[PDB]
């Protein structure tokens, strides 16, 4: 019984940070197999950030200017390259706690957990979501980035995030561990504005779920609804469109409480227009987004790795 | 920029996690040198639960009955003591990942990470309070008993936390490490109910600092009170008592927003009084009251372990 926002255990991604400094720039790195992966732009001054040509700034830079630290030990660095907005820096020891591990490319809605480092040692881990306009909502200061969020699957850990900048709105934008950004953010210290910050609808429909497995069932109303119907409320309310993809994603949480997925969207809708007035669910006072259906399955039924 | 529920990173105690079997009761135990610590009642049938005489079910229990597993590995147990609610079983093996530690019994309004474990094996972590009514809202199903709650101060774990109990309300029951329950509860099947939940007001303060510190300031107002004015709004809502001491400890946090202390509280007797009329604050549509003026300190600095 009870419902927390849980982050995966850390323990295997904290094996694998380190420490890159290049110049008077140091960020996190993550070390797996015999390469160091960060961001690219611990190569730049703060001059650079402003306007910076990557490819012109890495020709100033050699294998002994990247200093890798792993715990109180330094790394000695055989190369680097540029893959996109990573660097890839290739040293001569293989991490000895490297994980069985996968890069992945997340879609929006998709949740992971952040361990937060500074100077390649961790701060704190908690959980994330991928928001619809490509940004994460994470805790972050100067000397986070290199920053990882991950999955694990019993035994291997699945990095999706890298995390680069902080926007001015102090929104959070980031990379896969191929380099390529989430949404359309660049590494420049530029204005970027993110789009509409729209609410991931199956995990709140997830989320209600749940706190009726807990107990938490004054929300449950007398009505149904259908896909187009439930849309055109969702669309006023800046919720994302609900997909028979998701309803079918739904089914076995469906299946555990005998409440059909359309009555729990009018569920959702009647929460909608009315508000909570002042009630809570699973302890909060808003609709919670950041379970997926997968997330409430794992945490009730006790999954482990 | 950000501020989000954190845990401490998992690793060190995910080392110390083991399986503890009792004829047909499976639940977790804390390894940490030659002593494995768990709950007493892995000795009782579910008949054993709703009475149980702990020292008479001893008596029928010798070293080679209590079955301890490390990962795939078995430990040899030469010997067994209870100490008040928890069982010591000595094992021939020193745990290699024994980390530097401490048993702490801490107080009402404290915060702990929570490493939730089932067959000696993590499933996820998050952080808890201790409530003053000396409960905490967790997130446990059967076969989590064992489980540990903990602080870690750079290189050294705390613990001060070790699961037991469900309450027919489903809040959540247990032990510090020298095995003495946390508030008025027995490690019986019997009704036990808990006191009143009160909000911790030196938390909700130092989230307001968070708050402040992060931008969001729209609650702040023109008006100052002093202890005992804000302390008769305080019970009429079910907040605890603020002290002098209070005010000490958010010292910092004042000194670094130039927010005198009550100040800030003249801003929460107004939230109390108003409510927050559909509006957020780090987005929560609630006051949060599970963050330490330690942990807004440690969370807004980017300290490491
Ligand atoms: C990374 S080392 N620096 C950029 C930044 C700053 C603050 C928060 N997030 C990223
Ligand atoms: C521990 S193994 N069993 C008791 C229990 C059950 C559910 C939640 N918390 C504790
Ligand atoms: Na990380
Ligand atoms: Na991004
Ligand atoms: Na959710
Ligand atoms: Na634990
Ligand atoms: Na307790
Ligand atoms: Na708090």
Redesign the interface.
């Known amino acids: 019984?009870?419902?927390?926002?849980?982050?995966?255990?850390?323990?295997?991604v904290?094996?694998c940070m380190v420490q890159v400094t290049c110049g008077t720039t140091t960020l996190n790195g993550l070390w797996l197999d015999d390469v160091v992966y960060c961001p690219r732009h611990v190569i730049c001054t703060s001059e650079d950030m402003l306007n910076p040509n990557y490819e012109d700034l890495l020709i100033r830079k050699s294998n002994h200017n990247f200093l890798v630290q792993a715990g109180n030990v330094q790394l000695r660095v055989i190369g680097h390259s540029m893959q996109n907005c990573v660097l890839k820096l290739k040293v001569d020891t293989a991490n000895p706690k490297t994980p069985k591990y996968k890069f992945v490319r997340i879609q929006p809605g998709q949740t992971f957990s952040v361990?937060?480092?500074?100077?390649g040692?961790?701060?704190?881990?908690?959980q994330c979501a991928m928001r619809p306009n490509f940004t994460i909502?994470?805790?972050?200061?100067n000397?986070?980035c290199g920053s990882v969020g991950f999955n694990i699957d019993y035994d291997c850990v699945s990095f999706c995030y890298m995390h680069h900048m902080?926007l001015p709105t102090?929104?959070?934008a980031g990379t896969d561990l191929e380099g390529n950004f989430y949404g359309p953010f660049v590494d420049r210290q530029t204005a970027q504005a993110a789009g509409t910050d729209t609410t991931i609808t199956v995990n709140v429909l997830a989320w209600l779920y749940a706190a009726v497995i807990?107990?938490d069932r004054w929300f449950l109303n007398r009505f149904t609804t259908t896909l187009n119907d439930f849309n055109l409320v969702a669309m006023k309310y800046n919720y994302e469109p609900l997909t028979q993809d998701h309803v079918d994603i739904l089914g076995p949480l469906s299946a555990q409480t005998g409440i059909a997925v359309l009555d729990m969207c009018a569920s959702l809708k009647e929460l909608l227009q009315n508000?909570?007035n002042?009630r809570?669910i699973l302890?909060?006072?808003?609709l919670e987004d950041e379970f997926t259906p997968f997330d409430v399955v794992?945490?009730?039924?006790?999954?482990?790795?």
Chains 1, 2 share one sequence.
Not at 121 to 126: I, M, N, R
């Open positions: 019984s009870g419902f927390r926002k849980m982050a995966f255990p850390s323990g295997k904290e094996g361990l937060a480092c500074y100077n040692s961790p701060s704190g881990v908690y909502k994470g805790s972050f200061l000397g986070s902080e102090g929104v959070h807990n107990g508000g909570m002042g809570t302890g909060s006072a808003l794992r945490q009730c039924s006790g999954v482990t790795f």
